[PDB]
């Protein structure tokens, strides 16, 4: 029951990083059609599928391996919420500054790198870089500037959970 | 009984959400932020250990609706620590960040009753008022006023999230 449920967690996590990928896509271009939604329906259904096959299950399996499962499941179910913030936030993107590019470019890395031992403590060193060169900016020159960049620091909020997450569900 | 241990978590919510109104209006003294947030954060993880420890005597239906309660309690949560890390960094305390602590104050002392909506639409007052202010001219004024911003957008999920576990 392991190489089962390792592909499933594994399977998962790929489902979870295309939408991730969707997402940094839709900030360079917002108005192409897009994959996000059709992605998103098959990692929900994809989750849905595999806690109602663990619970048809219960009867029958290790509780040890009931509690892993579930467990990591609530952090898979946690990073589709997290995506799901993160479309709202990019959704509402009226312009792509360079920031934005940036922001854009690093979502990709996060949604292509492997987790290994220092990767999640190098990605949120590399988000706080960003954070920090997004405070520092030159001021907005007007309201929908301000509200932009605003969306964009929300994004860097809903990231930092979202490499805590993924970083958790490696360390297990 | 689990009925209880969802007023409990929705009160122990609200006590956290009134430490970040403390922290707005004295961004620097001691605030009880780190000792509720961990008996938050505490019932959230034995509750929900608890739950799985169960899974094979307890009914299918009951555990999922308990499920249903704590993911919404899970993402309040998580926006009181976001809300956190941004009052956190709070240069002053501007007239409009003592209004937003008291409106904070308001839905923490809140029993919810309708009300979500009540509360939802004093919120957008507050962000039409907030817009409409002339942009900032300082670097510190601009900082705080970021920090407001970010705070009602996520109070907006607050309410929304508080107003699905109401009518559950």
Redesign the interface.
């Known amino acids: 029951n392991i190489h089962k449920i390792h592909e499933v967690q594994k399977k998962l996590q790929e489902e979870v990083s295309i939408v991730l990928i969707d997402i940094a896509d839709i900030i360079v271009n917002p108005k192409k059609e897009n994959g996000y939604s059709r992605d998103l329906y098959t990692l929900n259904s994809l989750i849905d599928s595999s806690i109602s096959e663990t619970?048809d299950n219960?009867?029958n399996t290790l509780?040890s391996d009931?509690?892993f499962f579930?467990?990591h499941m609530?952090i898979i179910?946690?990073q589709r919420?997290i995506l799901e913030n993160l479309y709202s936030y990019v959704s509402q993107l009226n312009s792509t500054p360079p920031q934005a590019h940036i922001l854009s470019a690093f979502i990709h890395k996060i949604g292509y790198t492997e987790f290994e031992a220092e990767t999640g403590n190098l990605l949120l060193e590399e988000l706080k870089r960003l954070m920090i060169s997004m405070?520092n900016q030159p001021?907005?020159v007007?309201?929908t500037e301000?509200e932009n960049?605003?969306i964009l620091?929300?994004c860097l909020?809903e990231l930092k959970?979202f490499l805590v997450n993924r970083k958790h569900a490696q360390m297990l």
């Open positions: 619970y219960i009867n509780l009931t509690r579930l467990e609530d179910k946690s919420d405070k001021l907005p007007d309201r301000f960049r605003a620091f929300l909020t959970q």
